[PDB]
């Protein structure tokens, strides 16, 4: 039901839960601070920065950057803000020889992204290329 609750479920059954993981992907900081409100002793007993000082801020900025890198990696393919969206790239049987009956059902996401690990950078590049083409075309289409 909750965070990662559909991890063992099939990809089709876990296609919507994306929202819960999404919230956590940032909202852990809310668990770290500002809802787990910093105790009045914070920064008086964390003047000793070497313990739980700099390192906590490292963790926060690293989480922020993971979020930004992924968000930019989405937007550079288009589909900014959308959990799910299609693209104009057809599926290569090289990456995976599996059916929707075998993909959306019968198998979990962990299995899936393991089974298509080595090709990840391939597909991403295609999406990037696709997005770029569209934008340029539209501009000239809008000029004509």
């Amino acid at each position: 039901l909750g965070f990662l609750g559909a991890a063992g479920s099939t990809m089709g059954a876990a296609s919507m839960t994306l929202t819960v993981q999404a919230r956590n992907l940032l909202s852990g900081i809310v668990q770290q601070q500002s809802n787990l409100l910093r105790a009045p002793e914070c920064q008086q007993h964390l003047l000793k920065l070497t313990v739980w000082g700099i390192k906590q801020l490292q963790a926060r900025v690293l989480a922020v950057e993971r979020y930004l890198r992924d968000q930019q990696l989405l937007g550079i393919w288009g589909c900014s803000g959308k959990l799910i969206c299609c693209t104009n790239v057809p599926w290569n049987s090289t990456w995976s020889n599996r059916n929707l009956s075998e993909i959306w059902d019968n198998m979990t996401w962990l299995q899936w992204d393991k089974e298509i690990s080595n090709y990840t950078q391939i597909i991403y590049g295609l999406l990037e290329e696709s997005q770029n083409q569209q934008e340029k075309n539209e501009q000239d289409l809008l000029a004509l």
């Binding site: 105790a39 002793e41 390192k55 992924d70 959306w104």
Partner: protein, 451 residues
């Protein structure tokens, strides 16, 4: 003809690592009363810890090479050092120390152990010295001769510093917590043994309350197995590995330093106070521990029964005390009340238990004030004395054993104390957990494309 779709927020993860952040109970100021584990773990826990069950999810765990133990090690050393850094230094407290054995209502054993030692001390003003005395334990002081000349042991290689008074290293249950983008997976396989994919796994905001307990050759104030006794070892057949033993009952131990102590607060420099041991108000007795004898017997019975498994059917099993070496590895070292108890465990491990073709056990204990904790990293931390009498009551929840080199003999497999690597003390809890990083973004085929 199937098409590419991108999915963001996928519930997947990979093995991961990061500086987990502390979460204390923060139940009251009395637990924040100058204790490092609460004063410096400023962040509290969720009052209601949450746990998400993961249906049909199997996850590999390996309590060995588990990063979070190393994180706890780095954190204890760091918190310790920074806590005891801004403290009064005893570095000029090295002179020829003139000692005589104390004998006043004293146990034959304590003879020599305790020792009155006259001394030349510095004062608040640079130009004045003052003649003082203090009692010292023989473990602290070494004899130098050409007969009554002495020094402190560590003074030839390291600087001696007091622990700040009114500072508590009483362990407090800590919940290690995953930052954003990360998660903690908890394994609940009964008899998991510490390795392999867990049959049932559950994501959790933070680990359960772990007390950073410092115990040697055994486990104190820890968790218990659900049934029988769990044996854990990275390589059971290798005799150089430490066997972690987790019980499903706790063993009752009462440790005590009976002597009624007094203290002198001497001024050595501007604002610099030294805590000296004054005369003992009561009689002189050795510290010691009472272990429940019948409980210990049935405990070792359970342990040997579980040991016979994977070591040969009806194989003969024997117990023996530790080897020689420095006291921190040969004896049960631990902290009680703020003082360091060094106990003879030889009365616990003995005899054979094959058993086929009430009362209390007394363990004497020495008291040591100057401490090199970890691998000579404490750097001569000097434990200040505590006025009065010291008593602790504890649960042994696990043992650290090592098998002798009996492989070529194929008979009477003999187990001895182990330990000395404090990571074990936390492994015995932190086996239950693993750190992972969410990899939310992925792709999959679909029936449709963009219009």
């Amino acid at each position: 003809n199937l098409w590419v779709t991108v999915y963001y927020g996928v519930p997947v993860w990979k093995d991961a690592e990061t500086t987990l952040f502390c979460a204390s109970d923060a139940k009251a100021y009395e637990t924040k009363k100058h204790n490092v584990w609460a004063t410096h773990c400023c962040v509290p826990t969720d009052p209601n810890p949450q746990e998400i069950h993961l249906e049909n999810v199997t996850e590999e765990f390996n309590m060995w090479k588990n990063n979070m133990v190393e994180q706890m090690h780095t954190d204890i050393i760091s918190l310790w050092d920074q806590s005891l850094k801004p403290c009064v230094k005893l570095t000029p407290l090295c002179v020829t120390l003139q000692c005589t054995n104390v004998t006043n209502n004293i146990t034959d054993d304590m003879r020599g152990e305790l020792k009155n030692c006259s001394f030349n001390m510095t004062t608040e003003l640079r130009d004045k010295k003052q003649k003082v005395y203090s009692l010292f334990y023989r473990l602290d002081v070494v004899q130098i001769n050409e007969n009554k000349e002495y020094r402190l042991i560590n003074c030839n290689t390291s600087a001696i510093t007091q622990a700040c008074p009114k500072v508590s290293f009483e362990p407090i249950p800590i919940h290690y917590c995953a930052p954003a983008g990360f998660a903690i997976l908890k394994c609940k396989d009964k008899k998991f043994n510490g390795t392999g994919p867990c049959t049932n796994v559950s994501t959790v905001q933070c680990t359960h309350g772990i007390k950073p307990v410092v115990s040697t050759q055994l486990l104190l104030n820890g968790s218990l197995a659900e049934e029988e006794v769990i044996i854990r070892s990275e390589n059971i057949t290798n005799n150089a590995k430490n066997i972690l033993v987790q019980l499903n009952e706790s063993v009752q131990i009462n440790c005590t330093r009976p002597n009624n102590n007094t203290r002198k607060s001497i001024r050595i420099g501007p604002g610099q106070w030294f805590y000296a041991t004054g005369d003992i108000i009561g009689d002189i007795r050795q510290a010691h521990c009472n272990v429940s004898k019948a409980t210990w017997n049935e405990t070792l019975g359970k342990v040997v029964k579980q040991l016979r498994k994977h070591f040969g059917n009806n194989t003969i099993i024997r117990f023996a005390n530790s080897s020689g070496g420095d006291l921190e590895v040969t004896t049960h070292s631990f902290n009680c009340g703020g003082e360091f108890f060094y106990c003879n465990t030889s009365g616990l491990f003995n005899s054979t238990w094959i058993s086929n073709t009430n009362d209390s056990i007394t363990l004497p204990c020495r008291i040591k004030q100057i401490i090199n904790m970890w691998q000579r990293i404490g750097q001569a931390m000097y434990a200040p004395p505590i006025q009065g009498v010291i008593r602790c009551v504890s649960n042994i929840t696990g043992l650290i054993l090592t098998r002798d080199g009996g492989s070529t003999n194929s008979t009477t497999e003999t187990f001895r104390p182990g330990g000395g690597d404090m990571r074990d003390n936390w492994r015995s809890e932190l086996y239950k957990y693993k750190v992972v990083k969410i990899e939310p973004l992925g792709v999959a085929p679909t029936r449709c494309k963009r219009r």
